[PDB]
Each structure stands twice: as structure tokens, then as C-alpha cells.
Amino acid sequence: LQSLAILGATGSIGDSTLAIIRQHPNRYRIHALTGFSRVDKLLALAMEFHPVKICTSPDNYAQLSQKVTDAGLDTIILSGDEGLIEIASDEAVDTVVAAIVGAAGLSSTLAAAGAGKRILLANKESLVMAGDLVIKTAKKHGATILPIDSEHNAIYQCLPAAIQADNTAIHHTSYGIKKLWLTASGGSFLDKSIKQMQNASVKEAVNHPNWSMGQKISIDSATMMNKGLELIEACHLFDLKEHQIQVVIHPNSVVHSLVEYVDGSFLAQLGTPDMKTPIAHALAYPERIKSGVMPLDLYQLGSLKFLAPDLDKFACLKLARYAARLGTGACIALNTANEIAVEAFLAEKICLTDIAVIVKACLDDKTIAQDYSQDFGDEVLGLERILTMDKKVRKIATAKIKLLKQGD
Amino acid sequence: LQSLAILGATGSIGDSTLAIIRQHPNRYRIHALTGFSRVDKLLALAMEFHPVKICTSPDNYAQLSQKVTDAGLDTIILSGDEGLIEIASDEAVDTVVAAIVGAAGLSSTLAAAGAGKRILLANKESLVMAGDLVIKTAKKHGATILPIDSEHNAIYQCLPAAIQADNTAIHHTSYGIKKLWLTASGGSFLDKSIKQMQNASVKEAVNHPNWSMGQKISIDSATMMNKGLELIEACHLFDLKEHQIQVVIHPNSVVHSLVEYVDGSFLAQLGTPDMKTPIAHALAYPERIKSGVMPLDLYQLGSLKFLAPDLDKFACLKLARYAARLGTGACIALNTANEIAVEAFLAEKICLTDIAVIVKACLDDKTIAQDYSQDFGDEVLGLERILTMDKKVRKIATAKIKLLKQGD
Ligand SMILES: NC(=O)c1ccc[n+]([C@@H]2O[C@H](COP(=O)([O-])OP(=O)(O)OC[C@H]3O[C@@H](n4cnc5c(N)ncnc54)[C@H](O)[C@@H]3O)[C@@H](O)[C@H]2O)c1
Numbered sequence: 154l155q156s157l158a159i160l161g162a163t164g165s166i167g168d169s170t171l172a173i174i175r176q177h178p179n180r181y182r183i184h185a186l187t188g189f190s191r192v193d194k195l196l197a198l199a200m201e202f203h204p205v206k207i208c209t210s211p212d213n214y215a216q217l218s219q220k221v222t223d224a225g226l227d228t229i230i231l232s233g234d235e236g237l238i239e240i241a242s243d244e245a246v247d248t249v250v251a252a253i254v255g256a257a258g259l260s261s262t263l264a265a266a267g268a269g270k271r272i273l274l275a276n277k278e279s280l281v282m283a284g285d286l287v288i289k290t291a292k293k294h295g296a297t298i299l300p301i302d303s304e305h306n307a308i309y310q311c312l313p314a315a316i317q318a319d320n321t322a323i324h325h326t327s328y329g330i331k332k333l334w335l336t337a338s339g340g341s342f343l344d345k346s347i348k349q350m351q352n353a354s355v356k357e358a359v360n361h362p363n364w365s366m367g368q369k370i371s372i373d374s375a376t377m378m379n380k381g382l383e384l385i386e387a388c389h390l391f392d393l394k395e396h397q398i399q400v401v402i403h404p405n406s407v408v409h410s411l412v413e414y415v416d417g418s419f420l421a422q423l424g425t426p427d428m429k430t431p432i433a434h435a436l437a438y439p440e441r442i443k444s445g446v447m448p449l450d451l452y453q454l455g456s457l458k459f460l461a462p463d464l465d466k467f468a469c470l471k472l473a474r475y476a477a478r479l480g481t482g483a484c485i486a487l488n489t490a491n492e493i494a495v496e497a498f499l500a501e502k503i504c505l506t507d508i509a510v511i512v513k514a515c516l517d518d519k520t521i522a523q524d525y526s527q528d529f530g531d532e533v534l535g536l537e538r539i540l541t542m543d544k545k546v547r548k549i550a551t552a553k554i555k556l557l558k559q560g561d
Numbered sequence: 562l563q564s565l566a567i568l569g570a571t572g573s574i575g576d577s578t579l580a581i582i583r584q585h586p587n588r589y590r591i592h593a594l595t596g597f598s599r600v601d602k603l604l605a606l607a608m609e610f611h612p613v614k615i616c617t618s619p620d621n622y623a624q625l626s627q628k629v630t631d632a633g634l635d636t637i638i639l640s641g642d643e644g645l646i647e648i649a650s651d652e653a654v655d656t657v658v659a660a661i662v663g664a665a666g667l668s669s670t671l672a673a674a675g676a677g678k679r680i681l682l683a684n685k686e687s688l689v690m691a692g693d694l695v696i697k698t699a700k701k702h703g704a705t706i707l708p709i710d711s712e713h714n715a716i717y718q719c720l721p722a723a724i725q726a727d728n729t730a731i732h733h734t735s736y737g738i739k740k741l742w743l744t745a746s747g748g749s750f751l752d753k754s755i756k757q758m759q760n761a762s763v764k765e766a767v768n769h770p771n772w773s774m775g776q777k778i779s780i781d782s783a784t785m786m787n788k789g790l791e792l793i794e795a796c797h798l799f800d801l802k803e804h805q806i807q808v809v810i811h812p813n814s815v816v817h818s819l820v821e822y823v824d825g826s827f828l829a830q831l832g833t834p835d836m837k838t839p840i841a842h843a844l845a846y847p848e849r850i851k852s853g854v855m856p857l858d859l860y861q862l863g864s865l866k867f868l869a870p871d872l873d874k875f876a877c878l879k880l881a882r883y884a885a886r887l888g889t890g891a892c893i894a895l896n897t898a899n900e901i902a903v904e905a906f907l908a909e910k911i912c913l914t915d916i917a918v919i920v921k922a923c924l925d926d927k928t929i930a931q932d933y934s935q936d937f938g939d940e941v942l943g944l945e946r947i948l949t950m951d952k953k954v955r956k957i958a959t960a961k962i963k964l965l966k967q968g969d
């Protein structure tokens with residue numbers, strides 16, 4: 154049985170992964186599950202799956218340990234980043250599903266690449282922040298990365314075998330890859346005024362017509378920063394630069410992305426927008442298995458729309474491309490600034506449209522820009538350099554926010 | 562240089578193939594070209610490409626031989642089926658592009674499979690009439706068949722490598738193929754009354770909103786018999802039965818077909834509707850090359866529509882499925898009856914809607930049905946059995962036509 158560690162098992166992605174595991178009992182073995190806040194849910198999962206190890210936040214380690222011994226499970230309990238690193242590099246784990254949101258998922262993603270694991274990547278902030286380091290580290294140790302993110306999973310499915318195996322093979326012109334097309338729903342405000350986004354409630358922004366997801370990715374979809382980040386994720390995953398990856402607005406969320414070839418062929422993945430499809434694909438690869446989705450019904454589709462992005466309205470996307478060209482430092486500035494203006498939007502401290510302002514101000518800040526020219530990809534020293542800039546952007550972005558609520 | 566024989570070089574498919582050859586001068590060598598009626602065009606091609614051999618109709622052999630000696634080419638001239646068989650099995654030919662329309666292309670398609678060639682198949686009537694025989698013969702001698710037909714080329718592009726190599730691999734459930742979806746434009750009368758198809762001029766039926774093609778395939782698209790035939794072609798190519806292949810109406814002709822997988826993934830090929838894309842793909846396979854098409858612009862797409870087939874209105878499609886289930890005899894009855902009611906529609910002897918009547922009457926005719934249980938796939942005797950039934954359906958369909966213009 155393929156041994157699984159599911160980092161971030163209590164969230165949206167975790168739910169879908171587990172929904173597939175329950176359909177395929179004697180194919181996968183759960184070795185570990187992790188959860189930051191939802192201690193009871195993690196316990197309920199523990200009791201269901203009898204995992205060898207679980208990990209939670211340090212604030213909950215004691216509480217959860219009591220509850221696990223009280224339930225008489227053999228389960229080892231772990232806490233913090235230290236626990237995640239352990240599970241991610243555990244000799245007994247074959248496959249890691251990286252579903253921790255944000256930067257918090259970076260160190261365990263690396264540990265997994267360092268340990269040579271099969272990694273199923275949901276956690277895109279890992280690649281936006283440490284793409285060179287993660288891929289380099291993975292290549293060096295024999296880790297395979299398969300993307301779970303819909304768009305990337307689509308693209309991956311639409312790529313010849315040799316380029317799934319080795320992403321550098323994509324520069325051999327025989328394979329004829331021209332460019333990659335990322336589909337974007339346009340989010341909750343696509344078809345609404347600039348003015349109306351300004352006054353968006355969290356309830357409006359957080360709820361998406363086609364997808365049910367975590368809070369963060371949800372907001373990122375509303376501003377289109379999600380595509381931004383996906384743009385940078387794609388560059389690392391498929392070993393390309395941003396000019397080779399373009400974005401098309403597609404509100405139906407049926408077409409999940411395309412690969413354009415030199416002969417005129419666009420290979421695309423279509424499906425109902427349900428993350429069990431890409432998770433299932435990535436779990437069973439190179440085989441396939443039933444996912445439990447309700448399949449897309451082509452008869453009732455109606456009309457699938459396509460539309461160029463409106464960049465004035467979705468500045469987050471302009472700014473992500475700009476950052477992708479600047480390299481890893483600017484992508485960190487990008488992602489972290491954005492991580493901060495999201496905690497801030499959901500806390501109701503800024504407007505939705507303020508997410509763009511904070512992120513630019515951060516990309517164009519002189520104190521942030523000093524670190525753009527650093528070697529964030531050094532095998533020994535890249536990690537501390539990435540985290541230090543993280544802490545730094547955290548401070549400055551926080552400062553920018555406070556400054557804005559009055560004036561600069 | 563890959564040596565090419567282009568059977569049917571003067572038609573629509575031939576034009577597109579050659580348009581690609583002219584873009585790729587030192588990749589492909591033209592060893593042979595063939596043309597039935599258009600002697601001057603065949604000559605002009607001869608002078609352009611200095612082929613080793615060409616073949617024409619028997620009625621033109623003398624005329625063309627004079628003209629070739631008058632122009633001082635070294636080119637060997639051939640005639641009739643005998644000439645096609647020779648070119649198709651020529652020791653010096655690597656690749657055969659099978660683009661003769663109708664049943665007339667069957668014997669040379671077989672000769673090419675018998676000789677173990679790489680075959681690029683446009684000519685779908687070959688598989689509708691002798692699918693088992695062609696595939697069996699190909700497998701036995703090491704011939705590779707790559708489809709040029711848009712839908713089949715799309716499906717092929719959307720299939721894993723192992724199933725492109727060996728079509729029987731598709732029954733291994735690991736690969737997770739659920740079903741194949743054939744897209745159909747719905748033709749010139751999709752959005753028009755039954756009543757208005759009745760009175761269709763040849764000019765209406767022959768001209769297609771999105772495609773420029775030969776006359777026959779053009780009419781077949783109007784009645785939707787083209788999808789019928791494509792349905793049977795798909796069964797042989799991909800080694801499935803008709804229940805596994807469904808049809809969706811898609812008027813934009815952008816999405817060219819899909820492959821549905823068990824996890825919910827639909828892989829589809831999109832592109833501007835231009836046969837240079839699939840020809841180019843098939844020529845360079847497993848590599849890719851520029852095709853000279855103007856690529857699809859996703860920004861200006863608008864809305865791609867999808868719609869269930871209206872089977873009352875497109876009886877030809879009901880009847881093809883029925884025939885696919887009946888087996889090869891009924892497919893011959895189907896294809897030939899249809900070949901006859903097309904010569905008859907374009908000659909202005911029957912109504913467009915009469916194509917359906919003639920073909921049913923032929924499928925349900927007791928004299929035709931006697932031969933349904935024959936072994937059309939016997940390596941020694943299948944070919945004469947296929948041609949005899951052809952001649953027979955030709956006679957009876959002709960009779961049915963004459964009968965209808967008065968009454969049965
Ligand atoms: N939700 C989707 O459908 C979807 C689609 C594509 C990509 N993704 C990506 O997958 C990842 C997870 O997204 P999600 O929507 O499931 O997130 P979520 O908000 O549902 O939470 C995910 C998990 O992260 C854990 N977590 C949160 N903060 C943590 C911390 N500081 N340390 C350790 N663990 C922590 C939570 O306990 C939870 O199990 C993200 O990177 C997201 O961008 C999600």
C-alpha cells in the first residue's frame with residue numbers, strides 16, 4: 154500500500170483527498186495527518202484512520218495528546234514545524250500531499266523534496282516563494298512533484314510523457330510546446346463595477362460561484378491574485394518564463410487550462426470544477442481511478458465563454474507578472490504582502506481594492522527591493538534568506554496598511 | 562528524408578498536405594502523387610515535386626504520359642487500382658497518406674497495411690468498409706495507422722502513449738478511458754427546419770460555415786452521416802464498440818473531440834478548423850512541426866456552444882449507430898447506400914432528406930441483410946466479399962432511388 158502523509162488534512166483540499174481515500178480503502182495507507190487549529194476534527198480523523206503520527210499547533214499539542222490517549226489510539230502526536238518536517242521526511246512515508254496554506258507550508262514541502270518523496274502539491278505559495286529551491290532540491294534528491302492545483306494539473310495532463318517525467322525536456326523544440334494558457338473564473342466580481350468591488354463585504358468576496366475552497370484562495374480568486382500566483386507556480390513547475398504563459402478569463406470553470414502546440418493544437422483539460430478530479434489523477438498517476446465527482450454533462454453545458462483579462466480592474470495580475478519577471482525576491486514580496494492584505498481584508502481592516510495598493514507599494518518599496526538580487530536558491534542558505542524576507546515583508550506590509558488607513 | 566506517397570494528392574486533403582510539405586522542404590521527399598480526374602493539376606504537381614511515380618485514371622493514362630514526356634520529367638506514370646497498389650506497397654515509400662475518397666481508396670489502403678507502411682488516414686470509408694481487415698492486416702505486418710481526420714486526430718492526441726502505440730491497451734482499466742466524445746458542427750442546416758432541408762439546393766448543402774472540403778464529406782456533414790461514419794471509424798481505430806462513443810453537437814468547430822476519463826477529466830483538442838493541424842501532427846509524429854495554420858485566438862472566441870444531437874432530424878446518425886452494432890456488412894450497406902444517394906443528390910435526382918430514406922431502406926432490405934453474417938475480415942477472402950457487397954448495394958440502392966421517385 155502506498156503510504157500517505159497529508160499535510161493540511163483538515164482543510165478543503167484535505168477533505169477532498171480523504172473523500173477519495175474512503176473510496177479506495179485497500180490502495181492507500183494513511184501514515185500521517187496534520188491540522189493546525191481544528192483539534193476535534195483532527196481527532197475524529199485520527200479515530201477514523203488510525204494514523205501512525207499526527208501533528209498540530211503548539212498551542213494544541215497538550216490538549217490533543219490527552220484526547221488521543223483518552224481514545225486509546227497508538228497514534229504519535231507531534232507539533233509545530235518540527236513535526237511537519239518529521240512527517241514530511243519520514244522513512245515510512247511514500248507520498249506527501251502538501252496542503253498547508255501559505256508560507257507556513259514551505260519548510261515541510263522542502264523536507265519532502267529533500268527526502269525524495271512523491272509530492273502532491275496544492276500549496277502553491279511554496280513554489281511562489283521558493284520555486285528554485287524546491288525544484289532544485291527535488292531534482293537533486295529524486296523527489297517527483299505532481300500538481301494538484303486544477304490549472305497545473307490540467308496542463309500536466311495535457312503535456313507529453315517525457316515532459317511530465319522531466320520538465321526541462323520542454324525546451325527541446327521537437328515537442329512543439331508554444332505556450333501555456335491558464336484559465337481564470339474571473340471570480341465573484343468579474344461582471345461588476347470597480348466601484349462595487351471597493352465596497353465588497355467579506356461574505357461577497359469569500360463565496361465563489363463555482364468552487365468551494367479555503368478562505369485565502371477564495372479571496373485571491375476575487376482579486377485575481379490567485380492567477381498571479383498560479384502564473385509563478387507554472388513557471389517553476391513547467392520550467393518556463395512568464396512570457397510563455399498567458400491568461401484567459403473563462404467564467405464557467407469548465408475548461409481548466411490549455412497547452413498550445415506549434416501545429417495549432419490546443420490540448421485542454423475539461424471537467425466539473427471539483428478538486429477530487431485533479432487529486433485523484435495525481436494520487437493514482439500514472440494510473441487512473443474513479444474520483445467520485447459527478448462528471449461534466451456536455452449536453453447541459455450551454456455556452457462556454459472566453460474573454461481577455463481586464464488588467465486595470467485586476468491589477469493583482471499585472472503585479473504578479475511584473476514580479477515573475479523580477480525573480481524570486483519580488484515573488485516573496487508579492488506573496489507575503491498579499492498574505493498580509495488578506496488577513497487584513499477578512500479582519501475587515503481594509504477594502505478589497507486595497508489589496509492591490511498594498512502589494513504594489515511593497516513591490517516598489519526601496520527597503521524590500523534591496524533583497525531582490527539575492528540567491529534565494531542556494532542549497533545551504535536559501536531557506537533562511539526566504540524566511541528573513543518573509544518576516545521583513547510582513548513588517549513592511551503591515552506598516553503600509555497602517556499608513557494607508559491615514560495617508561502616505 | 563521520410564519518403565511520402567500521397568494517394569489523392571489533387572483533392573482538398575492533398576492540397577493541405579502539400580501546403581505543409583512546401584513549408585518543410587528538407588524533411589520530406591515526395592516519392593509519389595496520384596490523381597483521378599485533374600490531369601493538368603497532377604502534371605503541375607509533377608513538375609513542382611519531381612516525383613518518382615504518379616498514377617491517374619485509365620482514361621487519362623495516355624494523355625498524361627504524353628504530357629510528362631513533353632515536359633521532360635523522369636517520372637514513371639501508372640494507372641488504375643493497379644497503380645495505386647504499387648505505389649502503396651513500394652519498397653521505397655515510407656509513408657502513405659491515404660486521401661482517396663470513398664471505397665475507391667480501400668485496396669491501396671490495404672496494400673499499404675499489407676506492406677507495413679506508416680499510413681496517414683484521411684480516407685474514412687476504408688475503415689467503415691474494411692475496418693477489421695485493415696486493422697488486422699496492419700497489426701500482422703507492422704503497419705502504423707495515424708488518423709488525419711480531425712476528430713480522430715484529436716482523440717488520438719488526447720490518449721496516453723501506450724494506446725497510440727497499441728490500441729488494444731485501451732481495455733486495460735488502469736488507463737481509465739471511459740468514453741470518447743465526437744464533436745459535430747451540425748452542418749449547414751443545424752439551425753433550420755426539417756422542411757427547409759427538404760428543399761435544400763446543392764449550393765446550400767455543399768457549402769459549410771467553418772470548413773472547406775471535398776464535395777462528398779461536405780454533404781455528409783449537412784446530413785450528419787459524416788459523424789455516423791466517423792463513429793464507425795472510431796470503433797476500429799480505437800478498438801471500442803459504439804456504446805463507448807457518443808456525439809455532441811458543437812457548431813463553432815473549435816473543440817474537435819474529447820476523451821473522458823474515470824476521474825472526471827475530459828481531454829480535448831481545440832484549434833481553428835483547418836486540416837493542416839492534424840495532418841502536420843500526423844506527419845511529424847511523435848515530433849511536432851509548424852503547420853502554417855492561423856492559430857486559434859482565445860480572446861476572440863466568444864461562446865462555444867454544446868447541444869445534444871437531434872436524432873429525428875439527423876436520422877443518418879441513428880442509422881450509423883444501428884449499423885455499427887450490426888457489424889461490417891451493415892456498415893458497407895450503410896456507406897455504399899450513402900455513396901449512391903450522394904452521387905444522386907449532387908446530380909439533383911433526389912432531395913437532401915431522401916439520403917436518410919434510401920439508406921434505411923437499404924439497411925432493412927432482405928437481400929442486403931443476407932450478407933450481414935459474413936466474414937468480411939478473412940485475411941484471404943475478405944476483400945472480394947467486401948467488394949461484392951459493395952457492387953450489390955450499389956445496384957439495390959440505385960434501384961431504391963428509382964423506386965422512390967415513383968413509390969414503393
Ligand atoms: N481549496 C481548493 O480547492 C484549492 C484549489 C487549488 C489550490 N489550493 C491550494 O491548496 C492549499 C490549501 O488550501 P485550502 O483552501 O485547502 O486551505 P484551508 O484554509 O482549507 O486550510 C488548509 C490546511 O492548512 C492548515 N494550516 C493553516 N495554517 C497553518 C499553519 N500556520 N501551519 C500548519 N498548518 C496550517 C489547516 O490546518 C488546514 O488543514 C493552499 O495552498 C491553496 O492555495 C486549494
Ligand SMILES: NC(=O)c1ccc[n+]([C@@H]2O[C@H](COP(=O)([O-])OP(=O)(O)OC[C@H]3O[C@@H](n4cnc5c(N)ncnc54)[C@H](O)[C@@H]3O)[C@@H](O)[C@H]2O)c1
Nearest residue numbers: 569570571572573574596597661662665683684685774775
Ligand atoms: N476535406 C477534408 O477536409 C477532410 C476532412 C476529414 C476527412 N476527409 C476524408 O479524406 C478523404 C479525402 O476527402 P477530400 O474532401 O480531400 O476529397 P476530394 O474529393 O477533394 O479528393 C479526393 C481525391 O481522391 C481522388 N479520387 C476521387 N475519386 C476517385 C476514384 N474513383 N478512384 C481513384 N481516385 C479517386 C481524387 O483524384 C482526389 O485527389 C475522404 O475520405 C474524406 O472523407 C477529408
Ligand SMILES: O=CN(O)CCCP(=O)(O)O
Nearest residue numbers: 303337338339340374379
Ligand atoms: O485550482 C483551482 N483553483 O485555484 C480555484 C480557481 C479560482 P479562479 O479560476 O477564479 O482563479
Ligand SMILES: O=CN(O)CCCP(=O)(O)O
Nearest residue numbers: 711745746747748782787
Ligand atoms: O474532420 C473534419 N471534418 O470531418 C469536417 C467535419 C464537419 P462536421 O463536424 O459537421 O462533421
Ligand SMILES: [Mg+2]
Nearest residue numbers: 302303304383
Ligand atoms: Mg488553481
Ligand SMILES: [Mg+2]
Nearest residue numbers: 710711712791
Ligand atoms: Mg472529421
